[PDB]
């Protein structure tokens with residue numbers, strides 16, 4: 038798949054699904070867990086799916102990184118997914134939806150670099166234009 | 177004139193409402209949602225007129241979506257106004273249940289308590305294609 042979509046279930050489920058529909062309509066193959074994570078040990082499958090996708094779309098809904106803070110053992114799944122994307126040098130594309138930019142030091146050192154990528158503001162009023170800009174960011 | 181009017185709460189149902197719009201348009205329906213089709217003029221007339229003109233009334237019941245309607249007996253809340261118009265016009269009302277808690281009828285103004293008597297569709301994150309197929313079957 039061209040695109041891996043990483044998101045928080047309790048706050049980004051609808052936006053992540055909306056993004057999947059739009060990207061598939063423009064010709065991109067998309068991984069989101071509820072449609073592409075199939076049989077087996079999900080720990081391995083999820084990481085392999087991040088490693089295989091050229092683009093890493095990160096849904097930054099309100100508080101999306103809160104469960105990453107102080108996750109020193111790296112047991113939080115958004116944390117694991119971001120570290121994998123960073124380690125593999127993927128095209129990281131953050132989607133900003135009411136997200137408050139935290140200070141880097143509140144985040145584990147192995148994912149602080151996520152804050153250095155250019156993010157795209159999600160606009161409820163200009164969704165077609167938001168989508169067209171996301172397509173420009175994808176490789 | 178649109179086949180479907182989508183009623184929703186900005187602060188909790190914005191993304192689901194937009195997702196329903198995309199899916200319904202892909203299946204050949206003309207859809208009204210405010211951010212794409214409410215244009216110039218006094219919006220109070222234009223909003224009520226757009227409910228009246230659509231055969232189907234799709235209501236996004238996200239968590240707490242009817243809270244601002246409670247004790248709104250002056251009918252100044254917009255979801256309240258849209259529901260009342262839909263009920264009064266005998267529209268095909270199709271509630272979409274997304275984590276919604278069913279309230280006792282007595283907490284709502286009497287002119288909209290009937291919205292709770294319509295058969296609602298449970299939104300499933302895991303089975304979204306199947307949810308959309310059921311919504312289409314409910315549309316006229």
Ligand SMILES: C[C@@H](c1cc[n+]([C@@H]2O[C@H](COP(=O)(O)OP(=O)(O)OC[C@H]3O[C@@H](n4cnc5c(N)ncnc54)[C@H](OP(=O)(O)O)[C@@H]3O)[C@@H](O)[C@H]2O)cc1)N(C)C(=O)NCC(F)(F)F
Nearest residue numbers: 042043044045046047070071072074079083114115118302
């Ligand atoms: C573990 C879970 C998972 C978690 C995280 N991500 C990635 O990470 C981000 C979301 O992160 P997140 O923080 O929002 O999500 P959670 O960690 O909170 O887990 C959410 C719910 O999955 C329940 N749950 C626990 N164990 C299992 C299990 N063996 N099988 C099925 N469900 C399980 C858990 O049950 P609970 O803990 O007892 O409540 C909780 O209900 C995204 O980017 C994602 O790709 C991916 C998958 N998982 C395999 C599925 O969902 N599989 C079903 C699917 F349809 F998706 F394939």
Ligand SMILES: C[C@@H](c1cc[n+]([C@@H]2O[C@H](COP(=O)(O)OP(=O)(O)OC[C@H]3O[C@@H](n4cnc5c(N)ncnc54)[C@H](OP(=O)(O)O)[C@@H]3O)[C@@H](O)[C@H]2O)cc1)N(C)C(=O)NCC(F)(F)F
Nearest residue numbers: 162182183184185186187210211212214215219254255258
């Ligand atoms: C009044 C508002 C509106 C309200 C309700 N609905 C229906 O009702 C449900 C949503 O209900 P809701 O409870 O979620 O929405 P709100 O009542 O909270 O208001 C929403 C935000 O529109 C701000 N706002 C206040 N005055 C104006 C104004 N003259 N022009 C533009 N924006 C204004 C207000 O600013 P604020 O009050 O000062 O913060 C508040 O932020 C849906 O089904 C909807 O069809 C439709 C429209 N409106 C005309 C627009 O948005 N027009 C832009 C658009 F792109 F949509 F055309």
